[PDB]
Each structure stands twice: as C-alpha cells, then as structure tokens.
Amino acid sequence: SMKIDVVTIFPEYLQPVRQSAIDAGLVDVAVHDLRRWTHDVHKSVDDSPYGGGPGMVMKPTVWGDALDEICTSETLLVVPTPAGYPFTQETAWQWSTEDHLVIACGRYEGIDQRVADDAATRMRVREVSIGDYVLNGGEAAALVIIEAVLRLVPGVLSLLEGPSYTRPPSWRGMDVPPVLLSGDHAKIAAWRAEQSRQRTIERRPDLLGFDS
Amino acid sequence: SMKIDVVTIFPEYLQPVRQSLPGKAIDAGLVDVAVHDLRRWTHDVHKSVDDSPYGGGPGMVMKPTVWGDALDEICTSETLLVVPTPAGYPFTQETAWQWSTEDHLVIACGRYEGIDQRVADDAATRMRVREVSIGDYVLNGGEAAALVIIEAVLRLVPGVLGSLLEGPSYTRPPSWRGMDVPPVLLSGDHAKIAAWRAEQSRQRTIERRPDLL
Ligand SMILES: C[S@@+](CC[C@H](N)C(=O)[O-])C[C@H]1O[C@@H](n2cnc3c(N)ncnc32)[C@H](O)[C@@H]1O
Numbered sequence: 091s092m093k094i095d096v097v098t099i100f101p102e103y104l105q106p107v108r109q110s111a112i113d114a115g116l117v118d119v120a121v122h123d124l125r126r127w128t129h130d131v132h133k134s135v136d137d138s139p140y141g142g143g144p145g146m147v148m149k150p151t152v153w154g155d156a157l158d159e160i161c162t163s164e165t166l167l168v169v170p171t172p173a174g175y176p177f178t179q180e181t182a183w184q185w186s187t188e189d190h191l192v193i194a195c196g197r198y199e200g201i202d203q204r205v206a207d208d209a210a211t212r213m214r215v216r217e218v219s220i221g222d223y224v225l226n227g228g229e230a231a232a233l234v235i236i237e238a239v240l241r242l243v244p245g246v247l248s249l250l251e252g253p254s255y256t257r258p259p260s261w262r263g264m265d266v267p268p269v270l271l272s273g274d275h276a277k278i279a280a281w282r283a284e285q286s287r288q289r290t291i292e293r294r295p296d297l298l299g300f301d302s
Numbered sequence: 303s304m305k306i307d308v309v310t311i312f313p314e315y316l317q318p319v320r321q322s323l324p325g326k327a328i329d330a331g332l333v334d335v336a337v338h339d340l341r342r343w344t345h346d347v348h349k350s351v352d353d354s355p356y357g358g359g360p361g362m363v364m365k366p367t368v369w370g371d372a373l374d375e376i377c378t379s380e381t382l383l384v385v386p387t388p389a390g391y392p393f394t395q396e397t398a399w400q401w402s403t404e405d406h407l408v409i410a411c412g413r414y415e416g417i418d419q420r421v422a423d424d425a426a427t428r429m430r431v432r433e434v435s436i437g438d439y440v441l442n443g444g445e446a447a448a449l450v451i452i453e454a455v456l457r458l459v460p461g462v463l464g465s466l467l468e469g470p471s472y473t474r475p476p477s478w479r480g481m482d483v484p485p486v487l488l489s490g491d492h493a494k495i496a497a498w499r500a501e502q503s504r505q506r507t508i509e510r511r512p513d514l515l
C-alpha cells in the first residue's frame with residue numbers, strides 16, 4: 091500500500107489522476123492546495139529573486155509549513171526540476187516499493203533552494219528532471235512520475251521495442267510481415283530481436299554506446 | 303495561430319490543459335486545442351479499439367482500421383502527426399522550438415502495446431509523421447505524454463503560456479531555519495554575482511548531469 095501526496099497551487103490540474111489502481115485501493119493519492127498554509131489576506135507564495143534575474147521564486151516559509159504537516163522522517167520527498175538528476179525506469183522501480191511519496195510542484199522560476207536543503211536534514215530528498223525540455227510547472231511532471239511508478243507496484247504486477255501488428259493481415263495494400271503469420275516461434279523471436287536492435291541504432295544510438 | 307487536435311480513449315485526461323489556456327489567446331485566435339474520443343470511429347456495437355498481437359505474446363495492439371478512419375477525418379496534408387512512443391526519437395527543447403511554429407499538430411495517444419505500425423507508415427505517405435519519446439521510462443498511455451508536449455510547445459508561442467544546468471535560486475527572508483542566502487547575492491557587485499552563478503552551474507552539472515560535459 092502506497093500513499094502519494096501532491097502539493098501545488100493548481101490542485102485542479104491533478105484531476106487526471108482519477109482515471110486511476112486508486113480504485114483497487116493499492117495506492118491512495120491526495121492533492122493539497124499550497125495556499126492553505128499562507129496567513130496573509132493576499133495568500134502570497136512568491137517573491138523576486140535575490141541577486142537579480144527574470145521571474146519570481148516560490149517563498150520557503152509557506153513550503154516549510156506545508157511539508158512540516160505532510161511529511162515524516164520516512165517520507166521520500168520528490169521535487170521536480172529541469173536541473174534535477176534524471177528520472178528513469180530504474181528510478182521508477184526504486185520508488186515502487188516506497189510507503190510514502192510527497193511531490194512538491196513548483197511554478198514560476200522554481201522553489202527557494204533552502205526548502206529542499208531543510209527537508210534533507212529530516213528525510214530523503216530527490217530532485218529530478220523528467221526530460222530535456224522545459225515545462226511551465228511541476229504538475230505535469232507529477233502525473234508522469236505517478237503513472238510510471240504505479241504500473242510497477244506489487245499487486246499491479248536497454249533497447250527500444252520494435253513494431254506491433256494486429257488484424258486484418260492486409261490493410262490499404264500494406265501487409266503484416268509474413269514471419270509473424272508463420273507460427274514459427276524461433277523465427278518470430280529472432281525477427282523481433284533484430285527489429286529492436288535496428289530501431290535502436292537509428293533512433294537511440296547512445297543506448298548501444300554510439301555517438302549522438 | 304496553432305490548432306492542436308488530440309485523439310484518445312480518455313478525453314477527460316486533457317481537460318485541465320484546455321482550461322489552462324488564457325482567454326485572451328483564444329479570443330485572439332492564437333490557439334485552439336480540441337480533444338476527440340477515438341471510439342467515435344469504431345465499427346462495432348462493442349466499440350472495439352484493440353485486438354491480439356500477430357506473432358503472439360502478451361498485451362493487445364490498437365486497431366489500424368479505427369485509427370485510419372480517425373486520422374483520415376482529422377488530418378490534412380499540412381498536418382504534423384505526433385505519435386508518442388517509448389520507442390521514439392527523443393523529444394527535446396529543440397523539438398519543442400521547431401513545432402512551436404507549426405499550423406496544425408495532431409497527437410495520437412496510444413495504449414496497451416501501442417498502435418499497429420501500418421497507421422504511421424500509411425500516414426507518412428501523405429503528411430509529416432514524428433514518433434517521439436518524452437523520456438527513458440514507460441508510461442501506461444500517451445495522454446500524459448501529450449500533456450507534456452502541449453505544455454513545452456505552447457509556452458514557446460508568444461501570448462499563450464509562459465549545455466549547463468541552472469543553479470539554485472533564493473528569495474526573502476535572508477535567514478530561514480538557520481540557513482542564510484549566500485552573501486554574494488546581496489553584495490551589489492553584479493559581475494561577481496554572474497561569476498558565482500556560473501560556478502554554481504558548473505558544479506551542479508558535474509554532479510547531476512556529467513553527460514552534458
Ligand atoms: C519554468 S520551470 C523552472 C524552475 C526550476 N525549478 C529551476 O530551478 O530551474 C518551473 C517548474 O516546472 C517544473 N519543471 C519544468 N521543467 C521540468 C522538467 N524537465 N522536469 C521536471 N520538472 C520540470 C518544475 O517543478 C519547475 O520548478
């Protein structure tokens with residue numbers, strides 16, 4: 091059984107989690123509005139950066155109070171950031187056996203670095219990037235991470251995959267490769283292995299230790 | 303002016319991003335995102351979108367006849383067809399910049415083992431097709447990948463949304479839970495501040511992404 095808490099200034103953005111595993115009760119997902127932990131009438135969560143620069147930075151005081159209430163020493167705190175360590179399939183396998191994930195979603199130019207630093211004195215913290223592009227907020231990264239982790243959780247149960255096919259065997263004058271219709275398991279496995287390695291050298295040569 | 307059409311068996315998944323578009327951009331005709339239920343193009347009373355894989359094995363494959371009809375209706379010769387897949391070419395910031403000036407994106411969201419390969423192969427004989435991965439992990443469906451792609455592209459279109467790693471950022475208060483903002487940032491020596499930030503970027507990249515060096 092896993093608990094996932096997501097903290098955000100846009101809780102409505104996390105509604106896509108509800109095409110659930112949540113229904114099966116293996117995981118509980120709760121979404122929290124960061125503005126709940128403010129105290130001023132304007133409920134301000136951001137301020138200009140020290141040292142100059144474009145944009146705004148999320149204030150540490152509000153985040154500190156929220157994480158104080160939600161986290162324990164056993165929590166794995168996940169902080170999405172384009173400057174993070176890479177989130178990969180290996181990471182997903184690792185987090186699939188955790189009891190409690192808390193995902194802190196940033197906006198603007200991100201969260202004051204002292205929030206993560208303070209948290210690390212009490213719990214395990216992971217700052218992670220989901221890919222080499224820039225999003226407007228951490229909410230889409232939270233949805234990606236939750237999906238990748240949940241399909242590996244017990245109870246739900248290298249190379250690029252080659253192409254797949256289904257009926258009919260001929261469509262618009264395009265045929266399913268005849269080996270797949272041949273019923274020869276050894277020949278099919280061999281062909282599928284070759285397609286995978288061929289697609290990998292063309293699209294992701296780095297996976298096989300080549301340039302680019 | 304960009305049109306984005308998304309085709310999916312879970313249309314409600316895309317509904318946050320539609321509502322995140324500013325009214326001013328929509329009213330000015332800068333952007334229009336539309337979402338379509340794939341089952342609209344099914345042929346049978348059971349609204350079937352998948353079938354068993356040729357050659358055997360576990361899982362299911364999405365049907366070519368259903369997808370072919372959907373893309374026939376939605377795409378034109380000017381369309382850039384985006385097909386998310388963990389076996390695709392990598393989607394990067396460079397890709398996002400390129401797609402930000404397109405007139406028409408269509409995103410085909412897969413499920414299960416993916417879409418019968420003849421769909422993309424056929425489409426590529428009359429339009430541009432791009433099979434892309436958003437990262438080195440496996441998702442259950444293409445919808446989350448569509449959200450990522452739409453966000454990364456549209457924040458580069460003016461008025462819609464919006465090497466080395468960036469270093470840490472700080473704001474008020476100057477002291478918090480025993481931790482002070484680095485004094486250099488409050489110094490008013492802006493050449494020195496820029497050099498400090500550059501070195502912070504270098505250290506963070508060596509630690510977290512040595513591949514970038
Ligand atoms: C415009 S980004 C920049 C802020 C970022 N934290 C930084 O320090 O560079 C705003 C937020 O979107 C999220 N984000 C953007 N790109 C991301 C990526 N590639 N991976 C994970 N999260 C990302 C993070 O939550 C981030 O704080």
Ligand SMILES: C[S@@+](CC[C@H](N)C(=O)[O-])C[C@H]1O[C@@H](n2cnc3c(N)ncnc32)[C@H](O)[C@@H]1O
Nearest residue numbers: 251386387388412415416435436441443444447
């Ligand atoms: C379980 S995946 C595997 C299917 C995939 N098309 C294949 O043949 O390898 C099912 C669907 O989720 C989406 N998906 C999973 N991982 C993805 C990734 N890393 N990047 C983009 N889309 C992904 C794709 O739409 C894919 O068709």
